[PDB]
Each structure stands twice: as structure tokens, then as C-alpha cells.
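Structural prep section.
Before we set up the soaks we want a predicted structure of the protein with chloride ion in place, mainly to decide which crystallisation condition to try first. Input record follows.
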Amino acid sequence: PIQRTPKIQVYSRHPAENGKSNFLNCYVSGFHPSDIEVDLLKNGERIEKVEHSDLSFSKDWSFYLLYYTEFTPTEKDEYACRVNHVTLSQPKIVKWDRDMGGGGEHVSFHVIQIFSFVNQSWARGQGSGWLDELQTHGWDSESGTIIFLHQWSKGQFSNEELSDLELLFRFYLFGLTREIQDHASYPFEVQVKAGCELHSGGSPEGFFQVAFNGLDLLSFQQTTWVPSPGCGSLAQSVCHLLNHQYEGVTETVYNLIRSTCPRFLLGLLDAGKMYVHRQVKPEAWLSSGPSPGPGRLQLVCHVSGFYPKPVWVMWMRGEQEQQGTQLGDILPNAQGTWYLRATLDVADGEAAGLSCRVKHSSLEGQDIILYWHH
Ligand SMILES: CCCCCCC[C@@H](C)CCC[C@H](C)CCC[C@H](C)CCC[C@H](C)CCC[C@@H](C)CCCOP(=O)(O)O
Ligand SMILES: *[C@@H]1O[C@H](CO)[C@@H](O[C@@H]2O[C@H](CO)[C@@H](O)[C@H](O)[C@H]2NC(C)=O)[C@H](O)[C@H]1NC(C)=O
Ligand SMILES: [Cl-]
Ligand SMILES: [Cl-]
Ligand SMILES: [Cl-]
Ligand SMILES: [Cl-]
Ligand SMILES: [Cl-]
Ligand SMILES: [Cl-]
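Run finished without errors. Recording the C-alpha cells verbatim:
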């Protein structure tokens, strides 16, 4: 427990044009527990050879997953994202459709960990490193080794440092597992988010947060562990344990989270800048959306492939912003960049003369304008 339902978002990276190669993205989020089945379908057949990020979660602790593959839109062929979850009666198939528009400061670095305990002697585990919303690391479970997803994932650390880190992680895992395997009278899931935010001005902000069955359990605030008020005897127990019984583990954590993490983080940024990519022009295109009702249209404006994140997108009549404009979420793209789509609902007659306007930092001040037409 408890149960949350997956939001499902399907979208293409480029304008859809028959025979021309494209990328199909599927973003599955908001779910809990972590047990899930996601498949990209072509004409009902599951597509093998797809890319998927490792499992992560939000501040809410709900899980999310990115999927994508290469595909070609055609007149005949039908594509879908198929999801199966404990909160679904039947599997949900959401089609991708050109004419529906797809269907549906500070930097931070964190290590994310999910533990799934079905019983005493059976448990799943997985973890991964994330630079902002960008995964930079996986973790091989059998070997107990780090997986560096990119040419810069090492981030200006020597090999000795990272070896020591691997072993530190190994023993940390052995420790907690033994620790959770004790305390036995029972299905449950444990999530850990640990790492650092780096802020303008250089002040690091450390965090180590745990959750249980998707519930806020404990955290680490300024050299002292804190329980989230349940109460909460479990959290208070384990906190108290860490605070005193074995302190010195927290010396490591404290060091690791206030030092090494911001240094590694900065190392990633440095090594990252070499390859790509400072700024990227989006491309934009219009499509219809799902019909809002008889005698009404939904206009969809797609903005895809922009980086950095900040965008301004609006439906216009001349200089007048449209009141009804609805901005979707900013979603991740196949390799690194960003996707967003804005919709508007309008009567048939009032469709003509509406424009979608895009402002991005990389456009050099010359905005993208797209005019609706039939
Ligand atoms: C099966 C799940 C595997 C999960 C491992 C996935 C790891 C996967 C992301 C590899 C990326 C590695 C990445 C390249 C190097 C980043 C270096 C950063 C600065 C280190 C931050 C380490 C975290 C913050 C401290 C952990 C808390 C433990 C030390 C204390 C706990 C109490 O002890 P106890 O338990 O004994 O009682
Ligand atoms: C956790 O629950 C039981 C605990 O033993 C596991 O039971 C095993 O189930 C599979 C297939 O049914 C096999 O490993 C054996 O038949 C069972 N083991 C024993 C010792 O009887 C179970 O598989 C674990 N997790 C599940 C069922 O998801
Ligand atoms: Cl293959
Ligand atoms: Cl289509
Ligand atoms: Cl260090
Ligand atoms: Cl159109
Ligand atoms: Cl960004
Ligand atoms: Cl959306």
C-alpha cells in the first residue's frame, strides 16, 4: 500500500510526417507501488528495442518512468503505450495520434534507491544517479558496480575514488538490508532519496530522505536526523538508532552529502559542458487535439527539443493572449532536451486567425509564430 494510478503521456519528438523517421516518447508517472509493466506497441505487437530510464520518483514519492523508441508515422500503422498496474482493471492502451497531438537557481544531484520487500527471503532492489531530471548513473545489482551512462558520468573523479565509493555502497546496502531483514514479526516498499542541491552563491544543501510504503518516514536536517510526524514510532526508533547507537555512520553520510556530492556534481557539470549542449532551438508544430464537443475545436501547439528549460508558449489573437490557453507539463525528450505542448478550446468559427507564439532563450529574440488554418 497505498495505491496511486499512473498518468500516461505519449508524444512525438518531431512533427509527424509519413515515412519520415521520428521518436515516440512515453512518460509514465504518478504511480505507486513500483511494480509496473510499460510497453510501446506497433500495431498491437510489443516493440522490443526500446530505451527506458531507470525508476525514479518525485517529491510526492510517486514513481515515474520515461520510455522511447524510433518510429515512423504512416497512414496504416498504429502506435501505442500500454501500461499495466495493480490500480488498473485492464491494461491501458493509449494511442499516439497525429491529429490528437500524441495522446495521454540551483542544480541537484541525487542517488535514488527503491527496495521492494515481498517477504523475508525475497526482495527487489534498484538505484540510480540523477543530475537534475537527467539520469547519469545506473547500478548493476549482481556485481555491485556503478554503471556510467555517459562519457562524462565519471565527472572528474579518479578511478580509485569511484572504486572506494562502489565498496562503500556495497557495505551500506549489506548493512541496511541486514537491518531491515531483522525486525520481523508483510509486503512493503522502501524509497531513499539522498544527495545535494547546489545553489547560486555556492551554498550546498544536503538531503537524505526515506519513505515507507510511499509514506514520508525520516530525513536529515543540518547534522540531525528528523522523523516526519506520524507518529511514527518506527521512524522515531530508527532515527534515535542513527542519532546515537551507531553515530559515525552519519559522519560518513554528512561528509558524503556535504562534501564529495557537491564536488562530484560540479565535476559532472564540468565534464558535461564539453559534449553538449549549451542551447538548442526548439522546433514547433500545430495539430488538432481531442474534440472538446460538438461544434468546437481543440488547437494543440507543440514545442519540442528546447534547452535550457524556461519557455514561454501562448495562444494568441494578434497581441492578445488567449485566456483559455492550457500549458501541459514540460516533458523529457529522447536525448536530453525538452518537450511542452499548449492547448486551447475554441468554437469552429473563431478558429481562424489564432497563432501559437513561442519564446525561448535560444531563439535570439526572434519568436516562433505558427498560424492555425484549415
Ligand atoms: C540495490 C540498490 C542500489 C542503490 C545504489 C545505487 C547507487 C548508484 C546511483 C551509483 C551512482 C554512484 C555515483 C556515480 C557516485 C556519487 C557519489 C555521491 C557523492 C555519494 C552519495 C552517496 C549517498 C548519498 C550516501 C548513502 C547513505 C549511506 C552511506 C549511509 C546509510 C546508513 O548506513 P547503514 O545502512 O549501514 O545503516
Ligand atoms: C515470497 O514468498 C514466498 C516465501 O517463501 C516465496 O515462495 C516461493 O514461491 C516461488 C514460486 O511459488 C518458489 O520460490 C517457491 O515455490 C516458494 N518458496 C518456498 C520456500 O516455498 C515467494 O516466491 C516470494 N515472492 C513471491 C511469491 O513473489
Ligand atoms: Cl533486437
Ligand atoms: Cl497516425
Ligand atoms: Cl570529498
Ligand atoms: Cl494543422
Ligand atoms: Cl534545465
Ligand atoms: Cl499534457
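Observations: The longest strand covers residues 106-117.
Flagged for discussion at group meeting.
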